[PDB]
Amino acid sequence: WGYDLVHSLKSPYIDSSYRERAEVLVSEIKAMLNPAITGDGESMITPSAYDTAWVARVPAIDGSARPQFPQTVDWILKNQLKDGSWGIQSHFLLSDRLLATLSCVLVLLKWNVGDLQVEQGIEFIKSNLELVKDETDQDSLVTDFEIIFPSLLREAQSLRLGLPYDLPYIHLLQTKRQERLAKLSREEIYAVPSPLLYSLEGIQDIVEWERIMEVQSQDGSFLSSPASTACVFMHTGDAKCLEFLNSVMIKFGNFVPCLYPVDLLERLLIVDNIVRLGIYRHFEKEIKEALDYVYRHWNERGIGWGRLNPIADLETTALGFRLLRLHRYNVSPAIFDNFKDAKFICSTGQFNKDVASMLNLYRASQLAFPGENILDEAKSFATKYLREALEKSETSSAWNNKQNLSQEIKYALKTSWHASVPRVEAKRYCQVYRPDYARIAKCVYKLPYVNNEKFLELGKLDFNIIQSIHQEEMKNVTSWFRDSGLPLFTFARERPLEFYFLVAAGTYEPQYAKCRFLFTKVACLQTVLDDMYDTYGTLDELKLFTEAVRRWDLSFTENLPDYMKLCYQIYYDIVHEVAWEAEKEQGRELVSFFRKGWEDYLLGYYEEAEWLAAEYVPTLDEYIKNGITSIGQRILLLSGVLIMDGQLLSQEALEKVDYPGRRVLTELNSLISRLADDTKTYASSIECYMKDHPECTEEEALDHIYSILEPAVKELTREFLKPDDVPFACKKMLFEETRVTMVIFKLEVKDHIKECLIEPLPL
Ligand SMILES: [Cl-]
């Protein structure tokens, strides 16, 4: 590192024009999202050729021999792909094409039209069916393919279409249909809404249409599926079914999607992606509007992808729980009881949906507050589920490989939400986010409001702008450092950038330059004080230094060794500079408060020094007591949090996050830092406990230190997210410093500096 490999950086994105471009992107994104969150253009989703064909089957309600929705037939006739299939051209999935194409072929035949589209579709189905040698070739399956396709193929067979009904793969599908059906409770279908309502068109022989209405959605759909609803309508003539088909046609014009609406899931996927790309600070108003709406529909029974689903959806529910809690809404994890039996279920529907559900459960579980056992249990289950998912052949299908599913899953399992570097996570996500991401349900589909070029464009640009601003700040940091006198203390390693990284990688916003700078000065001072108290420097010297600390008198340093006279002078300057800035920002007297903090820190350290000089091993209690004040995280954290531009902290408000002796944010951070440090390194908490408990072994002692950490981490999360009248930026600054610390204590300190501060994203 050093002055050199820093003043050599040429921050290209520092120019005001880049930030101005970012603001145009922000404004375009707001305009793009408006219909989805405040307008009526919600649920923007691509066509389903398959569902459109089912809707096209509905005969005119006036009894004439034509479709009730002739525009759907027109759509079908006009949207066949070059290869004779129907579907999304950008993404080829066999089961999707197969299903949609046969669906379209059969409806064209019904109305005796599109004779040429029909012979091209048949050719495609027959051609592609013969490329499948075994199962490992079938690729990822759209929802309920094994059930629907054989029965569609039986329909074709009665019409005597030139399809290869005898292929082994076909027989295997019937076998798989028979095995899913065997385990189906038929009586339950009519009483309790289930996932099979999404595909009634595939089990027409089984369903008693006269009893199926008790489980119809309030909007008249069957589990939000147009195909499935169309089918029920053709058997029952039920008016609410028709109203639902009408509302979807009115909305889309001449086609239908495979799910409607998707108002809850879509809103949550937009927020999720904005948050993960690191660009959330530009969209506070939109995120609130999105989540407020989700919250309105949040209920004890969970939520589906749409607000009128008669059953909850784990994917949407787990995603909603996490985002809502993350944004300080009051949500209870008892919500996850809805997905239990007797323990959890899942692993029932189509693969990608199941994996997505467990990924979201895994992530949601990490946001646990104290005493939320159900979340510890959810984590356990999701982990096992996902570990097992990697061992499955489906995970390596051509489709999932194209999207790097296994990578995503592995990354999720090795990634702790608490032990994460926020700037680094955003940078990585900018590298994984796909503007043209395709999802799977009854057919392949996209949500353009969630996955688009603009998100990524802003994601990359905003990241680079922020980073270049930090590069300039690092120039000031290293210039200050070298004229500060601190490099003269050769018994201590120079780490100015490592400390800058610690605050900047979480508290990155441009307005908090001063907070980052002062935090960095204080951490630089501290590393020298640390090495002085525990390594360099005798007890008698330290007793003198500690006395001068009590005596805030520069003139008193005459009694100190030379190296200490200088140390005191630099220390005294830094303390009062921080204090002056804090008084400036806060409008209150704070020099007394800071002096009190520094003396507790350094008196705590002298005590540790005495213990060492005496080969004294404290009890665990007195070690903890001493260690959380002696580690000096508290005075370091105050040196940043009290100088955040525009963030006002009265004494009362400050006491809610900083109060020695209480389990508030600064105390928990101190505690977590001390103990996470001992557990990484291993005069420690381990050895203290083993003195306290002569019979206990080492691994017992360690496990006990973890038994102290895990609850502390949960308390930290609650204190952070808790609604209160403390400026959230302050609370977030304390929390993020803890998270970056937790990353540090789980040669790569430098690798993180490179990724985060040095190298830009390619544009
Ligand atoms: Cl994709």
> Could you tell me if 230 and 55 are in contact, meaning their C-beta atoms sit under 8 angstroms apart?
yes
Long-range contacts at 329-336 (CB < 8 A, ≥ 24 apart): 329/291, 329/295, 329/298, 330/723, 331/298, 333/364, 333/368, 333/372, 333/374, 333/375, 333/378, 334/300, 334/374, 335/300, 335/302, 336/361, 336/374, 336/375, 336/378
Q: Residues of 476-499 as b/e, b for ≥16 C-beta within 10 angstroms? A: ebbeebeebebeebeebebbbbbb
Distance 197 CA to ligand 1 centre (A): 28
Nearest to 580 by CA among 514, 482, 503, 630: 514
Q: How far apart are CA 512 and CA 505, in angstroms?
A: 12
Distances in Å between the Cα of 89 and the Cα atoms of 82, 593, 599 are: 9, 66, 69
Distances in Å between the Cα of 762 and the Cα atoms of 177, 431, 457, 459 are: 48, 10, 11, 12
For residue 615, is it left (φ>0), alpha (ψ between -120 and 50) or beta?
left
> Could you tell me if 202 and 165 are in contact, meaning their C-beta atoms sit under 8 angstroms apart?
no
Distance 25 CA to ligand 1 centre (A): 23
| Secondary structure letter of residue 99 according to DSSP | H
Task: Give the three-state DSSP class for 225.
Answer: strand
Write down the experimental method used for this entry: X-ray
For residue 637, give both structure tokens: 């954290």
Residues in contact with 62: Cβ distance below 8 Å, sequence separation at least 6, in sequence order: none
Q: How far apart are CA 412 and CA 662, in angstroms?
A: 34
Task: Give the three-state DSSP class for 348.
Answer: coil
Distance 434 CA to ligand 1 centre (A): 6
Distance 592 CA to ligand 1 centre (A): 58
Residues in contact with 42: Cβ distance below 8 Å, sequence separation at least 6, in sequence order: 35, 36, 261, 263, 266, 267
Between helices 665-681 and 620-630, what is the axis angle to 10°? 110
- Same domain? For 408 and 354 the reply is yes
- Same domain? For 151 and 230 the reply is yes
- CB-side exposure of 623: number of CA atoms within 13 Å? 20
Distance 428 CA to ligand 1 centre (A): 17
| Secondary structure letter of residue 336 according to DSSP | G
Distance 435 CA to ligand 1 centre (A): 8
Task: Give the three-state DSSP class for 669.
Answer: helix
Residues in contact with 129: Cβ distance below 8 Å, sequence separation at least 6, in sequence order: 98, 163, 164, 167, 169, 170
Full domain range(s) for residue 189: 47-261
DSSP letters, 543-569, are HHHHHHHHS--GGGGGGS-HHHHHHHH
Distance 441 CA to ligand 1 centre (A): 14
Distance 452 CA to ligand 1 centre (A): 11
Helix (H) and strand (E) counts for the chain? 33, 2
Helix (H) or strand (E) holding 715, with range, is helix 698-721
- Same domain? For 482 and 561 the reply is yes
Distances in Å between the Cα of 748 and the Cα atoms of 12, 743, 754, 758 are: 26, 10, 9, 14
Q: What is the CATH number of the domain that holds 516?
A: 1.10.600.10
- Same domain? For 321 and 363 the reply is yes
Length of the chain in terms of residues written: 763
Q: At 388, which amino acid appears? A: E
Count of domains forming the chain: 3
- Same domain? For 271 and 186 the reply is no
Is 530 flagged in the annotation as binding?
yes
- Same domain? For 23 and 168 the reply is no
Q: How far apart are CA 310 and CA 217, in angstroms?
A: 6
Is 175 flagged in the annotation as binding?
no
Angle at 328 between CA 327 and CA 329, to 5 degrees: 100
In the numeric block, the tokens 């408990």 are attached to 693
- How big is the chain by its Cα radius of gyration, in Å? 32
Distance 400 CA to ligand 1 centre (A): 9
Distances in Å between the Cα of 7 and the Cα atoms of 478, 485, 513, 658 are: 9, 20, 18, 37
Q: How far apart are CA 568 and CA 545, in angstroms?
A: 8
Distance 437 CA to ligand 1 centre (A): 4
Distance 439 CA to ligand 1 centre (A): 8
- Same domain? For 423 and 483 the reply is no
Domain boundary among 427, 443, 465: 465
Distance 380 CA to ligand 1 centre (A): 29
For residue 604, give both structure tokens: 């705590």
What would the 3-class secondary structure string for 398-462 be?
HHHHHCCHHHHHHHHHHCCCCCCCHHHHHHHHHCCCCCCCCEECCCEECCCCCCCHHHHHHHHHH
- Same domain? For 621 and 677 the reply is yes
- Same domain? For 553 and 649 the reply is yes
Distance 454 CA to ligand 1 centre (A): 16
Domain boundary among 465, 494, 512: 465
Q: How far apart are CA 43 and CA 34, in angstroms?
A: 12
Q: How far apart are CA 732 and CA 721, in angstroms?
A: 9
- Same domain? For 441 and 561 the reply is no
Distance 756 CA to ligand 1 centre (A): 27
CB count in 10 Å sphere of residue 553: 11
| Secondary structure letter of residue 758 according to DSSP | I
Is 681 flagged in the annotation as binding?
yes
- Same domain? For 654 and 742 the reply is yes
Q: What is the CATH number of the domain that holds 360?
A: 1.50.10.130
For residue 454, give both structure tokens: 């603009």
- Same domain? For 221 and 323 the reply is no
- Backbone torsions φ then ψ of 90, nearest 5 degrees: -65, -25
Nearest to 585 by CA among 634, 639, 631: 639
Q: How far apart are CA 755 and CA 180, in angstroms?
A: 48
Q: How far apart are CA 544 and CA 252, in angstroms?
A: 80
Domain boundary among 423, 439, 465: 465
Cis link prior to 47 (omega < 30° from 0)?
A: no
